[PDB]
Amino acid sequence: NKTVVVTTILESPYVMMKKNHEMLEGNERYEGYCVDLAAEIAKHCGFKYKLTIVGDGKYGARDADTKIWNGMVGELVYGKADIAIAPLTITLVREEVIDFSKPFMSLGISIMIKKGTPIESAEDLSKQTEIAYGTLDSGSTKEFFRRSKIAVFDKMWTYMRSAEPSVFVRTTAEGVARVRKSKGKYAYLLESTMNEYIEQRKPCDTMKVGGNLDSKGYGIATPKGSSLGNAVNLAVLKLNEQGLLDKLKNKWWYDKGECG
Amino acid sequence: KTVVVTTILESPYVMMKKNHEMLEGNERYEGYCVDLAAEIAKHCGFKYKLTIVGDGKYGARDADTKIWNGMVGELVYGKADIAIAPLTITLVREEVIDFSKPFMSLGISIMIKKGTPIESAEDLSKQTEIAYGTLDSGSTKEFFRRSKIAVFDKMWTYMRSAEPSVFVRTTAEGVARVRKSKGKYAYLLESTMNEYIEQRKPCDTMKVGGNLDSKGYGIATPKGSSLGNAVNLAVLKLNEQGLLDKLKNKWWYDKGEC
Ligand SMILES: O=C(O)[C@H]1Cc2c(O)noc2CN1
Ligand SMILES: O=C(O)[C@H]1Cc2c(O)noc2CN1
Ligand SMILES: [Cl-]
Ligand SMILES: [Cl-]
Ligand SMILES: [Cl-]
Ligand SMILES: [Cl-]
C-alpha cells in the first residue's frame, strides 16, 4: 500500500495555486475542479495520493524524432506517475499507450474571440487573413488540425503551420492574453471547457462563437494495465451518477463567475 | 467466427427497411447503429450477424431472480458477442459487461405535446394535472429509482405509484401516448430520440428544458472479451475521422417536415 502519485497540470480552473500557497505544503497548495475530483476519486477508491505538477507543463505528445512522450502522458508512460487527473483529452494515439477511464467531462474544440470580432465559425476564419488564429503549441487541438482531412480544417492548418510570426502559444493563458491584447486581430482555438471558463472571468471581454468543431472527453489516465484503472473508472461512473461531477462543474465555472 | 451482434429496434438507430419482409439477414435493417456496426466490423476485420434482442429490452437485473434481461443479458449469458445499440453506459452495467468509450453523448430529457405548460423537471414534480413517465425498463427508469436528488426523487415517488401505469414498453408507445393525451402526458426519454422525433411529422412534440443528466452510449462486449480492445480503438478512430458526426447528420438529417 503506497501513496499514489498524481500528475496534473496548472490550468484554471482544474488546478490553481491557492491564495496563501507560499506558506502551504503538499496537496494543500492547490485548489480547483481536478483537486476536488482527485479527492473524491481517492476516497471512493481508498488511497492516499500526492499531487505533482507535470515538469514540462505539457499534456502529452510523442516527439517524431526521438519518439519520446512528453507531458503528463510521458509521466505515465515512463512510470513517473501512477495516475493523471487533469483536462487530458481521450485520443486514439494516447489510448494506444495509456488507459483512460470513461469521460468525466465532455468538450469540443471551440473558437474564442475578443468581443466584437466579426467571426462566427471556423469557415469564417478559413476564408480571411485579417484575423490571425492559432492553437496551443502542443496537444490534441493542434493535432486535430494537423491530421484533419476535412477541407476547412486542413485549410486552417496549412495557414497556421506556416504563419509568421507563430500563431501557436505555449499555454492557454498566453492564448487568452493574445486574444485580449490583439484588438480583434487574433482568435484562439481551444477546448470548449477552457473557453466557457474564461468567458466567465473579468474583464469579460471574450466569448465562444459558433458550435464546437468536434466532440470528445476528458478521462482519468493510468499506465497501461495498471490495477488502479478499474476502480477509478467505476468511481468516475458513480460520481457522475450521483450528480457530483455536475456539481463540481458548476462550482468552478459558474457559481462564482465574475460576469453576472 | 461470425460475430453475433445484439441490437434493438429503436429509431433512428435500428429500423426495418421498407419491404423488409422480402429481405434477409443484415439487409433487413437500416439506421445509425446499422452503419456503425458496418464501420466497426470493417475496422476490426470481422464478419457479423445483426440480431434483434428477443425480449426487446435494453437490460436490467431482475430483483427476484437476479437474471439480466435485454441486450445486457444476451452478453452476460453468452448469447451474443457484442451489443451495438443506444445502450447507456452505467455503473451497474459496467460491473457486468465492458463498454467502449462513448460514441454518442446524451441526457435524460422531457418530451411534451406542443403547448403543454411545462418547462422543466421541477415543473412536472410540482403538479399532478399532467402525468409523466418513462420506459418501464432501462436506464431512465433506474435513474429516477436510484436518485437522491430532491426533485427527481419526488418525481419517482409519484411515477412508481401512479394509476394507471405511466410506464411504457417502448419509446414508440411513450411518444404515441404524448401525442394522444392532449397535453396530459409528458414522456421522460433520452435526448437523442427526443430530438429525432421533434423533427418528424406530425411535428406535434418538442423537447423542453435542458437535459437532466449527461452520459453516453457505448458499444458493449462480454466482460474481459478480447474483442473489447479492438472495438474501442475503432470507436476512437471513427470519432477522430469525423465519421460519427457524419452518421449523426445522416440519421438526424432534417428534411424540413417540421
Ligand atoms: O489533452 C490535451 O492535449 C489538451 C489540449 C487542450 C487545448 O487545446 N485546449 O485545452 C486543452 C486541454 N486538453
Ligand atoms: O440503455 C438504456 O437503458 C436505454 C434507456 C433509454 C430511455 O429511457 N430512452 O432511450 C433509451 C435508450 N437507452
Ligand atoms: Cl458512496
Ligand atoms: Cl482507415
Ligand atoms: Cl424495471
Ligand atoms: Cl410503498
Side-chain angles (χ1 to χ4, degrees), chain A residues 90-93 95-96 99-103 106 144 150 213-216 224 233-235 237-238 240-243 246, chain B residues 89-92 94-95 98-102 105 143 149 212-215 229 232-234 236-237 239-242 245:
Chain A
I90 299 166
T91 66
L92 175 55
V93 160
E95 191 80 80
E96 291 169 351
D99 295 343
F100 281 101
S101 71
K102 299 298 192 279
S106 308
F144 172 90
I150 299 176
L213 276 56
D214 61 7
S215 47
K216 46 205 180 189
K224 228 182 175 182
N233 185 50
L234 297 182
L237 289 179
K238 175 174 277 187
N240 185 23
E241 291 174 16
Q242 305 181 328
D246 286 342
Chain B
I89 299 163
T90 70
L91 175 51
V92 167
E94 190 77 82
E95 284 165 356
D98 297 340
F99 283 99
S100 69
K101 295 302 191 295
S105 285
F143 169 90
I149 300 183
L212 276 53
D213 61 8
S214 58
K215 48 202 183 194
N229 187 63
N232 187 54
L233 299 180
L236 293 176
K237 169 167 285 179
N239 190 8
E240 285 173 19
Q241 288 173 340
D245 288 327

Short mmCIF file of all heavy atoms in Angstrom, two decimals, chain A residues 90-93 95-96 99-103 106 144 150 213-216 224 233-235 237-238 240-243 246, chain B residues 89-92 94-95 98-102 105 143 149 212-215 229 232-234 236-237 239-242 245:
data_model
loop_
_atom_site.label_atom_id
_atom_site.label_comp_id
_atom_site.label_asym_id
_atom_site.label_seq_id
_atom_site.Cartn_x
_atom_site.Cartn_y
_atom_site.Cartn_z
N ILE A 90 -9.07 12.32 -24.21
CA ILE A 90 -9.01 10.94 -24.68
C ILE A 90 -8.84 10.95 -26.20
O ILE A 90 -9.69 11.48 -26.91
CB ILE A 90 -10.32 10.20 -24.34
CG1 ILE A 90 -10.53 10.17 -22.81
CG2 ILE A 90 -10.33 8.79 -24.93
CD1 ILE A 90 -11.96 9.77 -22.38
N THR A 91 -7.73 10.40 -26.69
CA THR A 91 -7.48 10.29 -28.13
C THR A 91 -7.00 8.89 -28.49
O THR A 91 -6.55 8.13 -27.64
CB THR A 91 -6.41 11.30 -28.62
OG1 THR A 91 -5.13 10.97 -28.03
CG2 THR A 91 -6.80 12.71 -28.26
N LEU A 92 -7.08 8.55 -29.77
CA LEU A 92 -6.67 7.24 -30.23
C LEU A 92 -5.20 6.98 -29.90
O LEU A 92 -4.85 6.00 -29.25
CB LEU A 92 -6.90 7.12 -31.74
CG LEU A 92 -6.40 5.84 -32.40
CD1 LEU A 92 -6.99 4.62 -31.72
CD2 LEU A 92 -6.74 5.84 -33.88
N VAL A 93 -4.34 7.89 -30.35
CA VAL A 93 -2.91 7.76 -30.16
C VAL A 93 -2.54 7.61 -28.68
O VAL A 93 -1.62 6.89 -28.34
CB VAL A 93 -2.18 8.96 -30.76
CG1 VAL A 93 -0.80 9.10 -30.18
CG2 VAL A 93 -2.12 8.83 -32.29
N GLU A 95 -4.67 6.47 -26.26
CA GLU A 95 -5.29 5.23 -25.81
C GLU A 95 -4.42 4.01 -26.19
O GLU A 95 -4.53 2.96 -25.57
CB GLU A 95 -6.70 5.10 -26.41
CG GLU A 95 -7.58 3.99 -25.84
CD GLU A 95 -8.24 4.36 -24.52
OE1 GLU A 95 -9.27 5.08 -24.53
OE2 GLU A 95 -7.74 3.92 -23.47
N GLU A 96 -3.56 4.18 -27.18
CA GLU A 96 -2.65 3.11 -27.58
C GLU A 96 -1.51 2.91 -26.57
O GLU A 96 -0.93 1.83 -26.52
CB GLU A 96 -2.08 3.38 -28.98
CG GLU A 96 -3.13 3.24 -30.09
CD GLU A 96 -2.65 3.76 -31.45
OE1 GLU A 96 -1.58 4.38 -31.53
OE2 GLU A 96 -3.37 3.54 -32.46
N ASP A 99 -4.07 3.91 -20.37
CA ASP A 99 -5.50 3.70 -20.16
C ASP A 99 -6.24 4.99 -19.75
O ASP A 99 -5.68 5.86 -19.08
CB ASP A 99 -5.72 2.64 -19.07
CG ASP A 99 -5.22 1.26 -19.48
OD1 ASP A 99 -5.00 1.03 -20.69
OD2 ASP A 99 -5.04 0.40 -18.59
N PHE A 100 -7.51 5.08 -20.15
CA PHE A 100 -8.38 6.19 -19.79
C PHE A 100 -9.67 5.66 -19.18
O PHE A 100 -10.24 4.68 -19.68
CB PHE A 100 -8.77 7.00 -21.01
CG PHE A 100 -7.72 7.96 -21.49
CD1 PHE A 100 -6.92 7.64 -22.58
CD2 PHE A 100 -7.57 9.21 -20.89
CE1 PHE A 100 -5.97 8.54 -23.06
CE2 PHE A 100 -6.62 10.12 -21.37
CZ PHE A 100 -5.82 9.78 -22.45
N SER A 101 -10.14 6.28 -18.11
CA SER A 101 -11.48 6.00 -17.61
C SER A 101 -12.49 6.47 -18.64
O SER A 101 -12.16 7.20 -19.56
CB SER A 101 -11.74 6.75 -16.30
OG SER A 101 -11.88 8.15 -16.53
N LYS A 102 -13.75 6.08 -18.46
CA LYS A 102 -14.82 6.74 -19.18
C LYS A 102 -14.73 8.23 -18.86
O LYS A 102 -14.25 8.61 -17.78
CB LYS A 102 -16.17 6.17 -18.75
CG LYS A 102 -16.34 4.68 -19.02
CD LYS A 102 -16.26 4.38 -20.50
CE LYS A 102 -16.71 2.96 -20.81
NZ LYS A 102 -15.66 1.91 -20.58
N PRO A 103 -15.20 9.08 -19.79
CA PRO A 103 -15.06 10.53 -19.63
C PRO A 103 -15.73 11.08 -18.38
O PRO A 103 -16.85 10.69 -18.05
CB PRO A 103 -15.79 11.11 -20.85
CG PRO A 103 -15.99 9.98 -21.79
CD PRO A 103 -15.95 8.71 -21.00
N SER A 106 -17.24 16.39 -20.90
CA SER A 106 -17.26 16.46 -22.36
C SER A 106 -16.76 17.82 -22.83
O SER A 106 -16.88 18.82 -22.12
CB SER A 106 -18.67 16.25 -22.89
OG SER A 106 -19.23 15.06 -22.36
N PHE A 144 -5.42 17.89 -33.98
CA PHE A 144 -6.67 17.82 -34.74
C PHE A 144 -6.53 18.48 -36.10
O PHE A 144 -6.96 17.95 -37.12
CB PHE A 144 -7.79 18.50 -33.96
CG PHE A 144 -9.07 18.65 -34.74
CD1 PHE A 144 -10.03 17.65 -34.71
CD2 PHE A 144 -9.33 19.80 -35.46
CE1 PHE A 144 -11.22 17.79 -35.42
CE2 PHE A 144 -10.51 19.95 -36.16
CZ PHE A 144 -11.46 18.94 -36.14
N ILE A 150 -10.70 17.09 -43.36
CA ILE A 150 -11.84 17.94 -43.67
C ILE A 150 -11.30 19.24 -44.25
O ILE A 150 -10.38 19.84 -43.69
CB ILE A 150 -12.68 18.17 -42.42
CG1 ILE A 150 -13.20 16.82 -41.91
CG2 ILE A 150 -13.81 19.15 -42.69
CD1 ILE A 150 -13.97 16.88 -40.61
N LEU A 213 -16.08 22.20 -32.94
CA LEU A 213 -15.59 21.59 -34.16
C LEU A 213 -15.65 20.07 -34.07
O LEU A 213 -15.68 19.37 -35.08
CB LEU A 213 -14.17 22.06 -34.46
CG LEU A 213 -14.08 23.40 -35.19
CD1 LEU A 213 -14.81 24.50 -34.45
CD2 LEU A 213 -12.63 23.78 -35.43
N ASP A 214 -15.66 19.56 -32.84
CA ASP A 214 -15.78 18.14 -32.60
C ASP A 214 -16.40 17.85 -31.24
O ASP A 214 -16.84 18.76 -30.53
CB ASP A 214 -14.42 17.44 -32.72
CG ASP A 214 -13.41 17.96 -31.72
OD1 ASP A 214 -13.77 18.77 -30.83
OD2 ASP A 214 -12.23 17.57 -31.83
N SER A 215 -16.45 16.57 -30.90
CA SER A 215 -16.98 16.15 -29.62
C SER A 215 -16.08 15.07 -29.03
O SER A 215 -15.84 14.03 -29.65
CB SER A 215 -18.41 15.63 -29.77
OG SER A 215 -18.51 14.73 -30.85
N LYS A 216 -15.59 15.34 -27.83
CA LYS A 216 -14.73 14.38 -27.14
C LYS A 216 -14.83 14.52 -25.63
O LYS A 216 -15.74 15.18 -25.12
CB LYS A 216 -13.29 14.47 -27.66
CG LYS A 216 -12.74 15.87 -27.78
CD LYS A 216 -11.63 15.93 -28.82
CE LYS A 216 -11.08 17.33 -28.94
NZ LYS A 216 -10.15 17.46 -30.10
N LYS A 224 -0.71 1.81 -18.81
CA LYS A 224 -1.43 0.70 -19.44
C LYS A 224 -1.38 -0.53 -18.54
O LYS A 224 -0.32 -0.91 -18.05
CB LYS A 224 -0.84 0.36 -20.81
CG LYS A 224 -1.89 0.21 -21.91
CD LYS A 224 -1.27 -0.17 -23.24
CE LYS A 224 -2.34 -0.44 -24.29
NZ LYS A 224 -1.78 -0.88 -25.61
N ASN A 233 -12.30 3.98 -12.83
CA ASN A 233 -13.37 4.04 -13.81
C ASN A 233 -14.73 3.90 -13.15
O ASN A 233 -15.64 4.66 -13.43
CB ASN A 233 -13.20 2.97 -14.88
CG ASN A 233 -14.23 3.09 -15.98
OD1 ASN A 233 -14.43 4.17 -16.53
ND2 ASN A 233 -14.92 1.98 -16.28
N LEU A 234 -14.86 2.91 -12.27
CA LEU A 234 -16.11 2.75 -11.53
C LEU A 234 -16.41 3.97 -10.67
O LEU A 234 -17.56 4.38 -10.54
CB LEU A 234 -16.06 1.49 -10.67
CG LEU A 234 -15.91 0.19 -11.47
CD1 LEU A 234 -15.92 -1.00 -10.53
CD2 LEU A 234 -17.01 0.08 -12.51
N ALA A 235 -15.37 4.55 -10.08
CA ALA A 235 -15.53 5.76 -9.28
C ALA A 235 -16.05 6.92 -10.13
O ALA A 235 -16.97 7.64 -9.72
CB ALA A 235 -14.21 6.13 -8.60
N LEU A 237 -17.81 6.73 -12.85
CA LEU A 237 -19.21 6.45 -13.18
C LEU A 237 -20.12 6.71 -11.97
O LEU A 237 -21.18 7.30 -12.12
CB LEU A 237 -19.37 5.01 -13.66
CG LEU A 237 -18.81 4.69 -15.04
CD1 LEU A 237 -19.02 3.23 -15.39
CD2 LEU A 237 -19.44 5.62 -16.09
N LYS A 238 -19.72 6.25 -10.79
CA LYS A 238 -20.51 6.54 -9.60
C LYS A 238 -20.68 8.04 -9.38
O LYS A 238 -21.78 8.52 -9.13
CB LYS A 238 -19.90 5.91 -8.35
CG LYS A 238 -20.64 6.30 -7.08
CD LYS A 238 -20.11 5.56 -5.86
CE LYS A 238 -20.74 4.18 -5.73
NZ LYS A 238 -20.35 3.51 -4.46
N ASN A 240 -20.48 10.43 -11.45
CA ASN A 240 -21.33 11.02 -12.48
C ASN A 240 -22.79 10.80 -12.11
O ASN A 240 -23.60 11.72 -12.18
CB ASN A 240 -21.06 10.41 -13.86
CG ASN A 240 -21.87 11.10 -14.95
OD1 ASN A 240 -22.29 12.24 -14.80
ND2 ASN A 240 -22.08 10.42 -16.06
N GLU A 241 -23.11 9.58 -11.69
CA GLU A 241 -24.50 9.23 -11.41
C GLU A 241 -25.06 9.90 -10.17
O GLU A 241 -26.27 10.12 -10.08
CB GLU A 241 -24.66 7.71 -11.36
CG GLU A 241 -24.47 7.08 -12.75
CD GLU A 241 -24.49 5.57 -12.73
OE1 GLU A 241 -24.95 5.00 -11.71
OE2 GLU A 241 -24.04 4.97 -13.74
N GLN A 242 -24.20 10.23 -9.22
CA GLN A 242 -24.64 10.92 -8.00
C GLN A 242 -24.86 12.40 -8.27
O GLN A 242 -25.43 13.12 -7.45
CB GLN A 242 -23.61 10.74 -6.89
CG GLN A 242 -23.30 9.29 -6.61
CD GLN A 242 -22.30 9.11 -5.49
OE1 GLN A 242 -21.41 9.93 -5.31
NE2 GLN A 242 -22.43 8.02 -4.74
N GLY A 243 -24.40 12.86 -9.43
CA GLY A 243 -24.52 14.26 -9.79
C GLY A 243 -23.35 15.11 -9.30
O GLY A 243 -23.36 16.33 -9.45
N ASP A 246 -21.49 17.19 -12.06
CA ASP A 246 -22.24 18.38 -12.46
C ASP A 246 -22.06 19.46 -11.40
O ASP A 246 -21.89 20.65 -11.70
CB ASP A 246 -23.74 18.08 -12.61
CG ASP A 246 -24.06 17.29 -13.88
OD1 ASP A 246 -23.22 17.25 -14.82
OD2 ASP A 246 -25.17 16.72 -13.94
N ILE B 89 -24.14 3.65 -21.01
CA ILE B 89 -23.08 3.27 -20.09
C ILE B 89 -23.51 3.63 -18.68
O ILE B 89 -23.76 4.80 -18.39
CB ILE B 89 -21.76 4.01 -20.41
CG1 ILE B 89 -21.30 3.66 -21.83
CG2 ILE B 89 -20.67 3.67 -19.38
CD1 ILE B 89 -20.27 4.63 -22.40
N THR B 90 -23.63 2.63 -17.81
CA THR B 90 -23.97 2.88 -16.42
C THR B 90 -23.04 2.08 -15.50
O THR B 90 -22.44 1.09 -15.92
CB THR B 90 -25.44 2.50 -16.07
OG1 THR B 90 -25.59 1.07 -16.10
CG2 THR B 90 -26.44 3.16 -17.01
N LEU B 91 -22.94 2.52 -14.26
CA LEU B 91 -22.11 1.84 -13.28
C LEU B 91 -22.54 0.39 -13.13
O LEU B 91 -21.73 -0.53 -13.26
CB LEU B 91 -22.20 2.55 -11.93
CG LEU B 91 -21.45 1.86 -10.79
CD1 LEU B 91 -20.01 1.54 -11.18
CD2 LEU B 91 -21.48 2.70 -9.52
N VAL B 92 -23.82 0.18 -12.85
CA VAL B 92 -24.32 -1.18 -12.65
C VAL B 92 -23.99 -2.09 -13.83
O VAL B 92 -23.55 -3.23 -13.63
CB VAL B 92 -25.83 -1.18 -12.34
CG1 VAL B 92 -26.39 -2.58 -12.45
CG2 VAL B 92 -26.10 -0.60 -10.95
N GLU B 94 -21.56 -1.60 -16.12
CA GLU B 94 -20.11 -1.65 -16.26
C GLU B 94 -19.53 -2.71 -15.33
O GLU B 94 -18.42 -3.18 -15.52
CB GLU B 94 -19.50 -0.29 -15.93
CG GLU B 94 -18.03 -0.16 -16.26
CD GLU B 94 -17.78 0.03 -17.74
OE1 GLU B 94 -17.90 1.17 -18.23
OE2 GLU B 94 -17.45 -0.97 -18.42
N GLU B 95 -20.29 -3.05 -14.29
CA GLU B 95 -19.87 -4.10 -13.37
C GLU B 95 -20.01 -5.51 -13.97
O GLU B 95 -19.31 -6.43 -13.56
CB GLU B 95 -20.65 -3.98 -12.05
CG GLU B 95 -20.13 -2.83 -11.19
CD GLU B 95 -21.08 -2.44 -10.07
OE1 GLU B 95 -22.19 -3.01 -10.01
OE2 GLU B 95 -20.71 -1.56 -9.27
N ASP B 98 -18.28 -5.04 -20.48
CA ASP B 98 -17.40 -3.95 -20.92
C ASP B 98 -18.06 -2.99 -21.92
O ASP B 98 -18.94 -3.38 -22.68
CB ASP B 98 -16.14 -4.52 -21.55
CG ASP B 98 -15.30 -5.31 -20.56
OD1 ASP B 98 -15.48 -5.12 -19.33
OD2 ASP B 98 -14.47 -6.11 -21.01
N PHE B 99 -17.61 -1.74 -21.90
CA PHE B 99 -18.06 -0.70 -22.82
C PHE B 99 -16.87 0.01 -23.46
O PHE B 99 -15.88 0.32 -22.79
CB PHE B 99 -18.85 0.36 -22.07
CG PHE B 99 -20.27 -0.03 -21.73
CD1 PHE B 99 -20.58 -0.48 -20.46
CD2 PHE B 99 -21.30 0.12 -22.66
CE1 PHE B 99 -21.88 -0.81 -20.12
CE2 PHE B 99 -22.61 -0.21 -22.34
CZ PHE B 99 -22.90 -0.67 -21.07
N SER B 100 -16.98 0.27 -24.76
CA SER B 100 -16.06 1.18 -25.43
C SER B 100 -16.25 2.56 -24.83
O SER B 100 -17.24 2.83 -24.16
CB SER B 100 -16.41 1.27 -26.91
OG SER B 100 -17.66 1.94 -27.09
N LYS B 101 -15.30 3.45 -25.08
CA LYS B 101 -15.53 4.86 -24.87
C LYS B 101 -16.82 5.23 -25.63
O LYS B 101 -17.19 4.54 -26.60
CB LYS B 101 -14.33 5.66 -25.38
CG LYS B 101 -13.02 5.39 -24.59
CD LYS B 101 -13.20 5.71 -23.12
CE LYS B 101 -11.87 5.71 -22.35
NZ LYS B 101 -11.21 4.39 -22.29
N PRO B 102 -17.51 6.29 -25.20
CA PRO B 102 -18.81 6.64 -25.81
C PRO B 102 -18.71 7.00 -27.28
O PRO B 102 -17.77 7.70 -27.66
CB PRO B 102 -19.24 7.90 -25.04
CG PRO B 102 -18.40 7.96 -23.83
CD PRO B 102 -17.12 7.24 -24.15
N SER B 105 -23.09 11.16 -27.08
CA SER B 105 -23.49 11.79 -25.81
C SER B 105 -24.99 11.94 -25.76
O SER B 105 -25.65 12.11 -26.79
CB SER B 105 -22.85 13.18 -25.65
OG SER B 105 -21.48 13.08 -25.32
N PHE B 143 -32.57 5.61 -13.24
CA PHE B 143 -32.10 6.93 -12.82
C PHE B 143 -33.03 7.54 -11.77
O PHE B 143 -32.58 8.04 -10.74
CB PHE B 143 -31.97 7.88 -14.01
CG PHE B 143 -31.74 9.33 -13.62
CD1 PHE B 143 -30.45 9.82 -13.46
CD2 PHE B 143 -32.81 10.18 -13.43
CE1 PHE B 143 -30.24 11.15 -13.10
CE2 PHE B 143 -32.61 11.52 -13.08
CZ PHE B 143 -31.32 12.01 -12.91
N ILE B 149 -31.47 13.06 -5.54
CA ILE B 149 -31.77 14.46 -5.82
C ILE B 149 -33.27 14.73 -5.58
O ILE B 149 -34.13 13.99 -6.06
CB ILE B 149 -31.37 14.82 -7.25
CG1 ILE B 149 -29.87 14.61 -7.43
CG2 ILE B 149 -31.76 16.25 -7.56
CD1 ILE B 149 -29.34 15.02 -8.81
N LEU B 212 -31.52 16.35 -17.99
CA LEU B 212 -31.47 16.12 -16.54
C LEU B 212 -30.12 15.55 -16.10
O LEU B 212 -29.72 15.70 -14.94
CB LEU B 212 -32.59 15.18 -16.10
CG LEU B 212 -33.98 15.77 -15.83
CD1 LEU B 212 -34.45 16.57 -17.02
CD2 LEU B 212 -34.96 14.66 -15.50
N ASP B 213 -29.42 14.89 -17.01
CA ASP B 213 -28.07 14.42 -16.71
C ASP B 213 -27.23 14.42 -17.98
O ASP B 213 -27.69 14.91 -19.01
CB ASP B 213 -28.08 13.03 -16.02
CG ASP B 213 -28.71 11.94 -16.87
OD1 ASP B 213 -29.02 12.18 -18.05
OD2 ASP B 213 -28.88 10.81 -16.34
N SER B 214 -26.01 13.90 -17.89
CA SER B 214 -25.13 13.81 -19.05
C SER B 214 -24.39 12.48 -19.06
O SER B 214 -23.63 12.18 -18.14
CB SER B 214 -24.13 14.98 -19.07
OG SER B 214 -23.36 14.98 -17.88
N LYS B 215 -24.60 11.69 -20.10
CA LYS B 215 -23.97 10.38 -20.18
C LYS B 215 -23.74 9.98 -21.63
O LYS B 215 -23.86 10.79 -22.54
CB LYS B 215 -24.80 9.34 -19.42
CG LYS B 215 -26.30 9.36 -19.74
CD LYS B 215 -27.10 8.74 -18.60
CE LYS B 215 -28.58 8.67 -18.93
NZ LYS B 215 -29.40 8.37 -17.70
N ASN B 229 -10.87 -4.50 -26.87
CA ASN B 229 -9.82 -3.55 -27.21
C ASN B 229 -9.95 -3.02 -28.63
O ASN B 229 -9.96 -1.82 -28.83
CB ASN B 229 -8.42 -4.15 -27.00
CG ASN B 229 -7.30 -3.11 -27.19
OD1 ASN B 229 -7.22 -2.13 -26.44
ND2 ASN B 229 -6.44 -3.34 -28.18
N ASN B 232 -12.87 -0.66 -29.14
CA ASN B 232 -12.67 0.66 -28.53
C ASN B 232 -11.78 1.56 -29.39
O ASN B 232 -12.09 2.73 -29.61
CB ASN B 232 -12.07 0.52 -27.13
CG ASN B 232 -12.01 1.85 -26.39
OD1 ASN B 232 -13.01 2.55 -26.26
ND2 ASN B 232 -10.82 2.21 -25.94
N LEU B 233 -10.66 1.03 -29.86
CA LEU B 233 -9.81 1.78 -30.76
C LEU B 233 -10.58 2.19 -32.02
O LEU B 233 -10.38 3.29 -32.54
CB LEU B 233 -8.57 0.98 -31.12
CG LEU B 233 -7.70 0.62 -29.91
CD1 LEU B 233 -6.49 -0.18 -30.34
CD2 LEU B 233 -7.28 1.88 -29.14
N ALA B 234 -11.46 1.32 -32.51
CA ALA B 234 -12.23 1.62 -33.72
C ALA B 234 -13.17 2.79 -33.47
O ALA B 234 -13.26 3.70 -34.28
CB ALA B 234 -13.00 0.39 -34.19
N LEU B 236 -12.81 5.15 -31.30
CA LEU B 236 -11.99 6.36 -31.20
C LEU B 236 -11.53 6.82 -32.59
O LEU B 236 -11.53 8.01 -32.88
CB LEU B 236 -10.77 6.13 -30.30
CG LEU B 236 -10.99 5.90 -28.80
CD1 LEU B 236 -9.68 5.59 -28.10
CD2 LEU B 236 -11.67 7.10 -28.14
N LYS B 237 -11.13 5.88 -33.44
CA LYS B 237 -10.71 6.27 -34.79
C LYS B 237 -11.86 6.89 -35.58
O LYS B 237 -11.68 7.89 -36.28
CB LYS B 237 -10.10 5.09 -35.55
CG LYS B 237 -9.89 5.39 -37.02
CD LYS B 237 -9.00 4.36 -37.70
CE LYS B 237 -7.54 4.57 -37.32
NZ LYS B 237 -6.66 3.56 -37.97
N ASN B 239 -14.50 8.42 -34.44
CA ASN B 239 -14.77 9.76 -33.93
C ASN B 239 -13.80 10.76 -34.53
O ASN B 239 -14.19 11.77 -35.11
CB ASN B 239 -14.66 9.78 -32.41
CG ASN B 239 -15.17 11.08 -31.81
OD1 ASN B 239 -15.74 11.91 -32.52
ND2 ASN B 239 -14.99 11.26 -30.52
N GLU B 240 -12.51 10.47 -34.42
CA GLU B 240 -11.49 11.41 -34.86
C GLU B 240 -11.50 11.65 -36.37
O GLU B 240 -11.12 12.72 -36.84
CB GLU B 240 -10.12 10.94 -34.37
CG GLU B 240 -9.95 11.21 -32.89
CD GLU B 240 -8.70 10.62 -32.30
OE1 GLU B 240 -7.75 10.31 -33.06
OE2 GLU B 240 -8.66 10.47 -31.06
N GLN B 241 -11.96 10.66 -37.13
CA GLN B 241 -12.11 10.83 -38.58
C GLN B 241 -13.38 11.62 -38.90
O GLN B 241 -13.64 11.96 -40.06
CB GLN B 241 -12.15 9.48 -39.28
CG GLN B 241 -10.81 8.77 -39.32
CD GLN B 241 -10.92 7.36 -39.88
OE1 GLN B 241 -12.00 6.77 -39.90
NE2 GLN B 241 -9.80 6.81 -40.33
N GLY B 242 -14.18 11.92 -37.89
CA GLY B 242 -15.44 12.62 -38.13
C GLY B 242 -16.56 11.74 -38.68
O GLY B 242 -17.61 12.23 -39.05
N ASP B 245 -19.79 11.92 -36.54
CA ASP B 245 -20.54 13.16 -36.81
C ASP B 245 -21.29 13.01 -38.13
O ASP B 245 -22.43 13.44 -38.27
CB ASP B 245 -19.59 14.37 -36.88
CG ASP B 245 -19.04 14.79 -35.50
OD1 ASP B 245 -19.74 14.63 -34.48
OD2 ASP B 245 -17.89 15.29 -35.46
#
